[PDB]
Amino acid sequence: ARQVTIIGAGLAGTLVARLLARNGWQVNLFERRPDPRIETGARGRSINLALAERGAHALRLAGLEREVLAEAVMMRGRMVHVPGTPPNLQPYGRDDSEVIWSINRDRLNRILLDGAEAAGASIHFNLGLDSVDFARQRLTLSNVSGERLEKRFHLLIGADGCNSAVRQAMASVVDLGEHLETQPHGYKELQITPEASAQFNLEPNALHIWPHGDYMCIALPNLDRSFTVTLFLHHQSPAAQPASPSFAQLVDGHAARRFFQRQFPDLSPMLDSLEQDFEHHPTGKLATLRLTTWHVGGQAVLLGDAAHPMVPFHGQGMNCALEDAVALAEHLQSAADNASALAAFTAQRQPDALAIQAMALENYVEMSSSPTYLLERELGQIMAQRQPTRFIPRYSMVTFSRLPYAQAMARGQIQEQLLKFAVANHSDLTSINLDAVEHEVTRCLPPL
Ligand SMILES: Cc1cc2nc3c(=O)[nH]c(=O)nc-3n(C[C@H](O)[C@H](O)[C@H](O)COP(=O)(O)OP(=O)(O)OC[C@H]3O[C@@H](n4cnc5c(N)ncnc54)[C@H](O)[C@@H]3O)c2cc1C
Ligand SMILES: O=C(O)CCn1c(=O)oc2cc(OCC3CCC3)c(Cl)cc21
Ligand SMILES: O=C(O)CCn1c(=O)oc2cc(OCC3CCC3)c(Cl)cc21
Ligand SMILES: [Cl-]
């Protein structure tokens, strides 16, 4: 049986462990954290993510989708909250088959852990990867106390997140051609209780947004009607705009409350523990990291966040990580050797990871922010009605299809260009020749 060592029992690592182990591979998975399935007396916060078709299909292939969806909250559309106006629901798709799912991160991780062990993988917790000796095929792990353990490896999979120790080790034997693009927004996680969400009539079957230009809040529902609220806000105020809001200006919980009362007045009354959450929850960091190289011969490979950290504005990081796990398991299972598998995996996934990284950055302005843009959307809907196999909105291609991200981006750009060009020099839909725009759709977009 072929052997593999996986670092990181997160989302991609556990899925790839199950897929390989059920194909008869001898799988050892090492995780720095303790086993979350071991119930303790600790009070762990109910953080969520959005599961879309790419992640759902990966779980479906693994035979875990039904179990994950049993605890997932349907999000039918985007609920935009702007003070003065009642909340407006913008459905994401054509019906309830085109929705996204709010899932508890910890619950998803537990189902994946159970799944990997059921398939025969061995999971070793409280062991963090410190270093790799590629020449000797040995690695060094340690617990929180720094007590070291050395292990031999045959194939190493780095599924160890955005601050990957496997990636750092690879960078000592190969030039990974890394480019780090820091993101100016930090994030803070806050909570809305089930009582508060019900009192203020907050729709449970929607993804909620409080746009505010340079900053915003997003809320995702939980099964118990609580919501996680995430504030995206600059770590520091820029030189050009010193007065502009930032985390640096919010010195304590009381400052955060005054900021919410002024900038998010319909949201602040729903945030009962705002002061405590602000002070006790650390401010998260966001970034985009692009690598030229994801592997070292047939010895080691990166996937998910270890390979391609991205900004979370499209809710596609986990979806991409699960899609990566399927691709990696498929290449490893069927290749002539590990070296061929790793090179083919990298060649297939790298253009798609770059496309989703770019689309995730672009989606911030879509959420956080026009007379011309409403005319564009109206025109885009007519085109989607007239040519349903040619004109598919970019959000739908990314979220509800398994079309390669690079193709979704390329088709999305043609669509965005067509709409922009068509509405330019026109104030309304009645002055636009619909058949001429449709001819450009049939000319530039092959049917899918
Ligand atoms: C604010 C925010 C919101 C997000 N929202 C969404 C969303 O709605 N939808 C979505 O699709 N994605 C979302 N994402 C992205 C998503 O969280 C990640 O892309 C996803 O978790 C990546 O999966 P992974 O397995 O590659 O990494 P991880 O899930 O981070 O797993 C890495 C694992 O490796 C372990 N580890 C780390 N270092 C070591 C080491 N040295 N040795 C051993 N183990 C180690 C970690 O403890 C962890 O268990 C969000 C991310 C952020 C920051
Ligand atoms: O354009 C839209 O209406 C939604 C885009 N999007 C998506 O489909 O899933 C998301 C998940 C997101 O983050 C959720 C986590 C922050 C802590 C929970 C964000 Cl920031 C954006 C998206
Ligand atoms: O009556 C009207 O409103 C204009 C119709 N019209 C036309 O006569 O030629 C067009 C060519 C167009 O696009 C060419 C390239 C931009 C990406 C393909 C468009 Cl989008 C619209 C037209
Ligand atoms: Cl994301």
Side-chain angles (χ1 to χ4, degrees), residues 96-318:
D96 281 359
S97 74
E98 295 186 331
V99 297
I100 51 172
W101 301 97
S102 179
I103 176 73
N104 175 269
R105 186 193 292 273
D106 178 62
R107 282 166 172 87
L108 172 61
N109 185 234
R110 294 181 194 206
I111 289 162
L112 288 167
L113 291 170
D114 283 347
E117 288 179 347
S122 291
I123 320 171
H124 313 285
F125 298 90
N126 310 289
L127 286 168
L129 181 75
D130 296 321
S131 58
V132 183
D133 182 333
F134 287 93
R136 301 184 192 200
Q137 312 177 51
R138 295 182 69 79
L139 48 81
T140 303
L141 308 136
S142 62
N143 55 26
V144 67
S145 305
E147 216 177 315
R148 278 162 193 174
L149 177 67
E150 275 185 37
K151 290 279 179 176
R152 195 244 203 270
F153 74 93
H154 292 273
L155 170 64
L156 188 60
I157 296 177
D160 49 340
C162 61
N163 298 319
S164 171
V166 173
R167 181 178 74 226
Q168 184 191 62
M170 283 169 59
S172 92
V173 291
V174 295
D175 183 2
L176 298 169
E178 316 186 30
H179 172 51
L180 178 69
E181 188 200 318
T182 59
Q183 218 270 344
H185 296 88
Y187 72 91
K188 185 82 71 178
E189 291 171 340
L190 310 169
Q191 323 302 132
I192 296 172
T193 67
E195 313 92 80
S197 80
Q199 186 192 322
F200 293 85
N201 305 300
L202 195 64
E203 176 56 54
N205 291 124
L207 187 142
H208 296 267
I209 303 159
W210 284 262
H212 214 303
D214 283 356
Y215 52 99
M216 57 170 191
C217 290
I218 295 129
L220 269 68
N222 288 316
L223 286 150
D224 71 346
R225 223 205 198 281
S226 64
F227 286 74
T228 62
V229 170
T230 307
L231 165 70
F232 289 105
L233 171 76
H234 291 159
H235 291 288
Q236 294 165 272
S237 308
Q241 284 274 27
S244 72
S246 72
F247 277 111
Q249 297 178 351
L250 308 176
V251 300
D252 62 19
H254 298 303
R257 172 70 71 183
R258 288 186 295 262
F259 170 70
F260 272 79
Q261 281 167 345
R262 187 189 184 86
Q263 306 305 346
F264 298 105
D266 303 307
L267 175 56
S268 186
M270 297 198 275
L271 298 170
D272 296 298
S273 62
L274 198 173
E275 295 85 351
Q276 298 77 10
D277 296 342
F278 203 84
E279 287 175 8
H280 297 100
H281 300 168
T283 305
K285 291 186 180 187
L286 301 178
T288 307
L289 178 73
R290 302 170 177 96
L291 324 181
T292 294
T293 298
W294 290 9
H295 71 102
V296 176
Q299 297 190 277
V301 65
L302 303 170
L303 86 161
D305 274 14
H308 48 66
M310 71 186 76
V311 302
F313 308 130
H314 211 305
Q316 283 288 312
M318 154 190 71

